[PDB]
Protein backbone atom coordinates (compact mmCIF):
# COMPACT_ATOMS: atom_id res chain seq x y z
CA UNK A 1 0.00 0.00 0.00
CA UNK A 2 1.20 3.54 -0.80
CA UNK A 3 0.89 6.74 1.30
CA UNK A 4 1.06 10.31 0.00
CA UNK A 5 1.11 13.53 2.03
CA UNK A 6 0.68 17.04 0.67
CA UNK A 7 3.82 17.87 2.62
CA UNK A 8 7.38 16.49 2.63
CA UNK A 9 8.96 15.27 5.86
CA UNK A 10 11.61 17.80 6.77
CA UNK A 11 10.01 20.69 4.89
CA UNK A 12 10.33 24.29 5.96
CA UNK A 13 8.04 27.11 4.82
CA UNK A 14 4.72 25.25 4.46
CA UNK A 15 2.42 28.15 3.48
CA UNK A 16 -0.62 27.20 5.60
CA UNK A 17 -3.14 28.78 3.22
CA UNK A 18 -4.32 25.26 2.37
CA UNK A 19 -4.92 22.19 4.56
CA UNK A 20 -2.63 19.21 4.96
CA UNK A 21 -3.67 15.87 3.49
CA UNK A 22 -2.66 12.25 3.16
CA UNK A 23 -3.88 9.79 0.56
CA UNK A 24 -3.75 6.00 0.58
CA UNK A 25 -3.06 4.15 -2.65
CA UNK A 26 -3.32 0.37 -2.79
CA UNK A 27 -4.98 0.23 0.55
CA UNK A 28 -6.86 2.20 3.14
CA UNK A 29 -5.88 4.77 5.76
CA UNK A 30 -6.02 3.17 9.21
CA UNK A 31 -4.69 6.03 11.35
CA UNK A 32 -3.62 9.65 10.96
CA UNK A 33 -2.57 12.06 13.70
CA UNK A 34 -0.97 15.47 13.44
CA UNK A 35 0.39 17.33 16.45
CA UNK A 36 1.98 20.73 17.00
CA UNK A 37 5.31 21.38 18.69
CA UNK A 38 3.79 21.73 22.13
CA UNK A 39 1.94 18.41 21.75
CA UNK A 40 -1.69 19.16 20.89
CA UNK A 41 -3.64 17.14 18.22
CA UNK A 42 -4.59 19.16 15.12
CA UNK A 43 -7.98 17.68 14.21
CA UNK A 44 -8.94 16.52 10.74
CA UNK A 45 -11.32 14.31 8.81
CA UNK A 46 -10.90 11.01 7.03
CA UNK A 47 -13.07 10.50 3.93
CA UNK A 48 -15.77 7.76 4.03
CA UNK A 49 -13.92 5.48 1.60
CA UNK A 50 -10.90 5.92 3.91
CA UNK A 51 -8.63 7.02 1.07
CA UNK A 52 -8.11 10.67 2.05
CA UNK A 53 -7.59 12.60 5.27
CA UNK A 54 -7.18 16.34 5.74
CA UNK A 55 -6.85 18.84 8.54
CA UNK A 56 -10.19 20.42 9.45
CA UNK A 57 -9.14 23.56 11.31
CA UNK A 58 -6.87 26.50 10.55
CA UNK A 59 -3.19 25.70 10.87
CA UNK A 60 -0.83 28.28 12.32
CA UNK A 61 2.32 30.20 11.40
CA UNK A 62 5.57 29.46 13.27
CA UNK A 63 4.40 25.96 14.01
CA UNK A 64 6.28 22.64 13.94
CA UNK A 65 3.95 19.72 13.16
CA UNK A 66 4.56 16.02 12.81
CA UNK A 67 2.39 13.60 10.84
CA UNK A 68 2.00 9.92 11.65
CA UNK A 69 0.01 7.94 9.12
CA UNK A 70 -0.40 4.23 8.46
CA UNK A 71 -2.08 2.58 5.49
CA UNK A 72 -2.81 -1.13 5.54
CA UNK A 73 -3.80 -2.83 2.33
CA UNK A 74 -4.86 -6.40 1.63
CA UNK A 75 -1.19 -6.91 0.83
CA UNK A 76 0.52 -5.47 3.88
CA UNK A 77 1.08 -2.37 6.01
CA UNK A 78 2.91 0.93 5.43
CA UNK A 79 3.70 3.77 7.83
CA UNK A 80 5.37 7.16 7.64
CA UNK A 81 6.35 9.95 9.97
CA UNK A 82 6.90 13.49 8.75
CA UNK A 83 7.62 16.65 10.69
CA UNK A 84 7.45 20.06 9.05
CA UNK A 85 7.54 23.79 9.85
CA UNK A 86 5.02 26.34 8.66
CA UNK A 87 5.76 29.86 7.46
CA UNK A 88 6.94 32.28 10.13
CA UNK A 89 5.96 35.72 8.81
CA UNK A 90 8.12 38.74 9.50
CA UNK A 91 4.96 40.83 9.84
CA UNK A 92 1.15 40.42 9.69
CA UNK A 93 -1.46 42.48 7.80
CA UNK A 94 -5.24 42.58 8.19
CA UNK A 95 -7.55 43.44 5.27
CA UNK A 96 -10.88 45.22 5.61
CA UNK A 97 -13.47 45.06 2.84
CA UNK A 98 -16.22 47.42 1.77
CA UNK A 99 -19.06 47.64 1.34
CA UNK A 100 -20.61 45.77 4.27
CA UNK A 101 -21.92 42.22 4.22
CA UNK A 102 -25.51 41.88 3.07
CA UNK A 103 -25.61 45.56 2.11
CA UNK A 104 -27.49 47.02 -0.87
CA UNK A 105 -25.61 49.76 -2.72
CA UNK A 106 -25.52 52.15 -5.64
CA UNK A 107 -24.35 51.37 -9.16
CA UNK A 108 -21.02 53.12 -8.61
CA UNK A 109 -19.90 51.24 -5.51
CA UNK A 110 -16.54 49.60 -6.16
CA UNK A 111 -15.18 46.62 -4.27
CA UNK A 112 -12.60 47.75 -1.66
CA UNK A 113 -9.82 45.89 0.13
CA UNK A 114 -7.77 47.97 2.55
CA UNK A 115 -4.71 46.48 4.29
CA UNK A 116 -3.36 48.02 7.50
CA UNK A 117 0.14 47.81 5.99
CA UNK A 118 1.87 48.52 2.67
CA UNK A 119 1.67 45.57 0.29
CA UNK A 120 5.03 44.70 -1.25
CA UNK A 121 3.60 42.12 -3.67
CA UNK A 122 0.34 43.43 -5.17
CA UNK A 123 0.07 40.49 -7.54
CA UNK A 124 0.01 38.13 -4.57
CA UNK A 125 -2.67 40.25 -2.94
CA UNK A 126 -4.79 40.39 -6.07
CA UNK A 127 -4.33 36.72 -6.83
CA UNK A 128 -5.68 35.99 -3.34
CA UNK A 129 -8.85 38.04 -3.90
CA UNK A 130 -11.64 36.06 -5.60
CA UNK A 131 -14.55 38.14 -7.00
CA UNK A 132 -17.76 36.52 -8.23
CA UNK A 133 -20.45 38.51 -10.04
CA UNK A 134 -23.93 37.62 -11.21
CA UNK A 135 -24.69 38.29 -13.95
CA UNK A 136 -20.98 38.00 -14.75
CA UNK A 137 -19.30 41.18 -15.92
CA UNK A 138 -15.68 42.00 -16.74
CA UNK A 139 -13.89 43.84 -13.93
CA UNK A 140 -10.32 44.67 -12.82
CA UNK A 141 -8.03 45.56 -9.91
CA UNK A 142 -6.30 48.92 -9.43
CA UNK A 143 -4.48 50.33 -6.39
CA UNK A 144 -5.39 53.72 -4.96
CA UNK A 145 -2.32 53.71 -2.73
CA UNK A 146 0.03 51.15 -1.13
CA UNK A 147 -2.70 49.80 1.16
CA UNK A 148 -6.01 49.93 -0.64
CA UNK A 149 -6.88 48.07 -3.82
CA UNK A 150 -10.21 48.41 -5.61
CA UNK A 151 -12.14 46.43 -8.18
CA UNK A 152 -14.85 47.59 -10.58
CA UNK A 153 -16.46 47.14 -14.02
CA UNK A 154 -16.04 49.45 -17.04
CA UNK A 155 -19.48 50.97 -16.74
CA UNK A 156 -21.69 51.40 -13.68
CA UNK A 157 -23.07 48.17 -12.24
CA UNK A 158 -26.34 47.00 -13.75
CA UNK A 159 -29.08 46.88 -11.06
CA UNK A 160 -29.80 43.47 -9.56
CA UNK A 161 -26.17 42.32 -9.79
CA UNK A 162 -24.82 40.19 -6.95
CA UNK A 163 -21.21 40.74 -5.93
CA UNK A 164 -19.25 38.23 -3.78
CA UNK A 165 -15.78 39.10 -2.49
CA UNK A 166 -13.50 36.52 -0.82
CA UNK A 167 -10.18 37.75 0.47
CA UNK A 168 -8.25 34.54 1.13
CA UNK A 169 -5.02 36.13 2.35
CA UNK A 170 -4.51 33.85 5.31
CA UNK A 171 -1.25 31.98 4.80
CA UNK A 172 -0.27 34.04 1.79
CA UNK A 173 3.06 35.82 1.55
CA UNK A 174 2.07 39.34 0.50
CA UNK A 175 5.71 40.33 0.10
CA UNK A 176 8.87 40.83 2.16
CA UNK A 177 7.62 38.38 4.79
CA UNK A 178 4.25 40.12 5.08
CA UNK A 179 1.54 37.50 5.67
CA UNK A 180 -2.23 37.77 5.77
CA UNK A 181 -3.51 37.89 9.34
CA UNK A 182 -6.73 36.15 8.34
CA UNK A 183 -9.45 35.83 5.70
CA UNK A 184 -12.46 38.08 5.16
CA UNK A 185 -15.43 37.73 2.83
CA UNK A 186 -18.15 40.32 2.23
CA UNK A 187 -21.13 40.03 -0.13
CA UNK A 188 -23.46 42.74 -1.47
CA UNK A 189 -26.04 43.54 -4.12
CA UNK A 190 -26.59 46.49 -6.52
CA UNK A 191 -29.88 48.39 -6.21
CA UNK A 192 -31.61 51.20 -8.08
CA UNK A 193 -29.70 53.56 -10.33
CA UNK A 194 -29.40 56.90 -8.60
CA UNK A 195 -27.40 59.56 -10.41
CA UNK A 196 -27.50 63.12 -9.10
CA UNK A 197 -26.01 65.89 -11.17
CA UNK A 198 -24.77 69.31 -10.10
CA UNK A 199 -24.38 71.75 -12.99
CA UNK A 200 -22.50 74.94 -12.13
CA UNK A 201 -24.46 76.60 -14.96
CA UNK A 202 -27.83 76.24 -13.24
CA UNK A 203 -26.55 75.61 -9.72
CA UNK A 204 -29.23 72.93 -9.27
CA UNK A 205 -28.62 69.38 -8.04
CA UNK A 206 -30.88 67.08 -10.08
CA UNK A 207 -31.54 63.61 -8.64
CA UNK A 208 -32.30 60.90 -11.21
CA UNK A 209 -33.65 57.48 -10.21
CA UNK A 210 -33.51 54.96 -13.06
CA UNK A 211 -33.23 57.84 -15.55
CA UNK A 212 -36.21 59.75 -14.13
CA UNK A 213 -36.01 63.18 -12.46
CA UNK A 214 -37.39 62.94 -8.89
CA UNK A 215 -35.84 66.00 -7.24
CA UNK A 216 -34.29 69.32 -8.18
CA UNK A 217 -32.23 70.97 -5.43
CA UNK A 218 -31.04 74.60 -5.50
CA UNK A 219 -27.38 74.48 -4.45
CA UNK A 220 -24.36 76.66 -3.67
CA UNK A 221 -21.03 74.94 -4.21
CA UNK A 222 -17.44 75.94 -3.54
CA UNK A 223 -16.61 79.56 -4.37
CA UNK A 224 -13.98 80.54 -6.96
CA UNK A 225 -11.43 80.66 -4.10
CA UNK A 226 -12.02 77.01 -3.20
CA UNK A 227 -14.23 75.42 -5.91
CA UNK A 228 -15.80 71.96 -6.21
CA UNK A 229 -13.90 69.79 -8.66
CA UNK A 230 -15.95 68.60 -11.60
CA UNK A 231 -16.26 64.84 -12.00
CA UNK A 232 -17.97 61.71 -10.77
CA UNK A 233 -18.25 61.29 -7.03
CA UNK A 234 -19.35 58.02 -5.39
CA UNK A 235 -21.70 58.42 -2.43
CA UNK A 236 -20.00 57.25 0.78
CA UNK A 237 -21.30 57.54 4.35
CA UNK A 238 -24.36 59.48 5.50
CA UNK A 239 -24.63 61.39 8.80
CA UNK A 240 -27.68 62.76 10.66
CA UNK A 241 -25.33 65.49 11.82
CA UNK A 242 -21.54 65.89 11.82
CA UNK A 243 -18.86 68.34 12.94
CA UNK A 244 -16.90 68.96 9.75
CA UNK A 245 -13.26 69.64 10.59
CA UNK A 246 -10.92 70.92 7.86
CA UNK A 247 -7.88 69.55 9.70
CA UNK A 248 -9.30 66.11 8.86
CA UNK A 249 -8.57 66.89 5.19
CA UNK A 250 -5.25 68.65 5.74
CA UNK A 251 -6.37 72.25 6.30
CA UNK A 252 -5.68 73.77 9.77
CA UNK A 253 -8.93 75.23 11.14
CA UNK A 254 -7.14 78.48 11.93
CA UNK A 255 -6.02 78.69 8.28
CA UNK A 256 -7.73 80.93 5.69
CA UNK A 257 -9.69 78.16 4.02
CA UNK A 258 -9.96 76.31 7.32
CA UNK A 259 -13.22 75.71 9.17
CA UNK A 260 -15.26 73.71 11.66
CA UNK A 261 -19.05 73.62 11.39
CA UNK A 262 -21.64 71.28 12.90
CA UNK A 263 -23.95 70.55 9.97
CA UNK A 264 -27.05 68.40 9.56
CA UNK A 265 -28.05 65.68 7.12
CA UNK A 266 -24.58 65.30 5.64
CA UNK A 267 -23.76 62.81 2.90
CA UNK A 268 -20.07 62.45 2.07
CA UNK A 269 -19.12 62.11 -1.58
CA UNK A 270 -15.39 62.77 -1.43
CA UNK A 271 -12.48 61.75 0.77
CA UNK A 272 -11.15 65.23 0.07
CA UNK A 273 -14.00 66.42 2.30
CA UNK A 274 -16.91 67.23 0.00
CA UNK A 275 -20.37 66.67 1.46
CA UNK A 276 -23.92 67.37 0.33
CA UNK A 277 -25.35 68.94 3.47
CA UNK A 278 -27.87 71.25 5.11
CA UNK A 279 -26.73 74.87 4.89
CA UNK A 280 -29.59 77.04 6.23
CA UNK A 281 -27.27 80.05 6.33
CA UNK A 282 -26.88 80.07 2.55
CA UNK A 283 -30.34 79.10 1.31
CA UNK A 284 -30.30 82.65 0.05
CA UNK A 285 -27.32 81.94 -2.21
CA UNK A 286 -28.33 78.37 -2.95
CA UNK A 287 -29.43 78.29 -6.57
CA UNK A 288 -27.61 81.51 -7.46
CA UNK A 289 -24.09 81.82 -6.13
CA UNK A 290 -21.31 79.58 -4.83
CA UNK A 291 -20.28 80.34 -1.26
CA UNK A 292 -18.78 77.12 0.12
CA UNK A 293 -15.30 75.68 0.55
CA UNK A 294 -16.38 72.89 -1.79
CA UNK A 295 -19.37 71.17 -0.23
CA UNK A 296 -22.70 71.11 -2.01
CA UNK A 297 -24.83 73.41 0.14
CA UNK A 298 -28.56 72.73 -0.08
CA UNK A 299 -31.63 73.64 1.93
CA UNK A 300 -32.19 71.69 5.18
CA UNK A 301 -35.26 70.20 3.55
CA UNK A 302 -33.32 68.82 0.59
CA UNK A 303 -30.30 67.60 2.56
CA UNK A 304 -32.58 65.41 4.67
CA UNK A 305 -34.43 64.20 1.59
CA UNK A 306 -31.01 63.39 0.19
CA UNK A 307 -30.07 61.55 3.40
CA UNK A 308 -33.23 59.43 3.24
CA UNK A 309 -33.24 58.56 -0.49
CA UNK A 310 -29.55 58.26 -1.34
CA UNK A 311 -27.45 55.19 -0.56
CA UNK A 312 -23.72 54.54 -0.50
CA UNK A 313 -22.60 53.63 -3.97
CA UNK A 314 -25.00 55.99 -5.71
CA UNK A 315 -23.47 58.71 -7.87
CA UNK A 316 -23.09 62.47 -7.81
CA UNK A 317 -21.71 64.09 -10.95
CA UNK A 318 -20.46 67.67 -10.90
CA UNK A 319 -20.00 69.55 -14.17
CA UNK A 320 -18.94 72.99 -15.44
CA UNK A 321 -17.42 74.40 -12.24
CA UNK A 322 -14.33 76.63 -12.29
CA UNK A 323 -12.46 73.90 -10.47
CA UNK A 324 -10.54 70.99 -11.93
CA UNK A 325 -11.41 67.29 -11.89
CA UNK A 326 -11.78 65.12 -8.81
CA UNK A 327 -8.66 62.95 -8.38
CA UNK A 328 -9.04 59.34 -9.45
CA UNK A 329 -7.33 58.13 -6.28
CA UNK A 330 -9.30 60.43 -3.97
CA UNK A 331 -11.14 57.48 -2.47
CA UNK A 332 -14.54 58.07 -4.02
CA UNK A 333 -13.27 59.28 -7.38
CA UNK A 334 -12.63 55.85 -8.88
CA UNK A 335 -14.78 56.44 -11.96
CA UNK A 336 -12.69 59.35 -13.19
CA UNK A 337 -9.84 57.02 -14.18
CA UNK A 338 -10.23 55.88 -17.84
CA UNK A 339 -11.25 52.23 -18.17
CA UNK A 340 -8.19 51.72 -20.38
CA UNK A 341 -5.81 52.76 -17.61
CA UNK A 342 -7.86 51.03 -14.89
CA UNK A 343 -8.14 47.65 -16.60
CA UNK A 344 -4.36 47.65 -17.09
CA UNK A 345 -3.92 48.11 -13.36
CA UNK A 346 -0.84 49.03 -11.38
CA UNK A 347 0.08 45.80 -9.59
Curated annotation (Swiss-Prot):
It is found in: Cell membrane. One of its GO terms (molecular function) is peptidoglycan L,D-transpeptidase activity. Pfam families: Big_10, YkuD. Keywords: Acyltransferase, Calcium, Cell membrane, Cell shape, Cell wall biogenesis/degradation, Lipoprotein, Membrane, Metal-binding, Palmitate, Peptidoglycan synthesis, Signal, Transferase, Virulence. Ca(2+) binds at residues 173, 176-177. The keyword Lipoprotein applies. This is L,D-transpeptidase 2. It comes from Mycobacterium tuberculosis (strain CDC 1551 / Oshkosh).
Amino acid sequence: PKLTASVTDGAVGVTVDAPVSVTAADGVLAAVTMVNDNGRPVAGRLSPDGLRWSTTEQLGYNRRYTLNATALGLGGAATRQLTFQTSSPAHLTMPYVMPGDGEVVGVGEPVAIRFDENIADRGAAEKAIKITTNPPVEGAFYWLNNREVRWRPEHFWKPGTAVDVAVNTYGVDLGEGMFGEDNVQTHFTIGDEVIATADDNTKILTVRVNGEVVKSMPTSMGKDSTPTANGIYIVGSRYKHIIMDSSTYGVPVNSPNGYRTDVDWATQISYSGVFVHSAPWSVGAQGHTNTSHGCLNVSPSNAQWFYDHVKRGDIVEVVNTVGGTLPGIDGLGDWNIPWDQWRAGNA
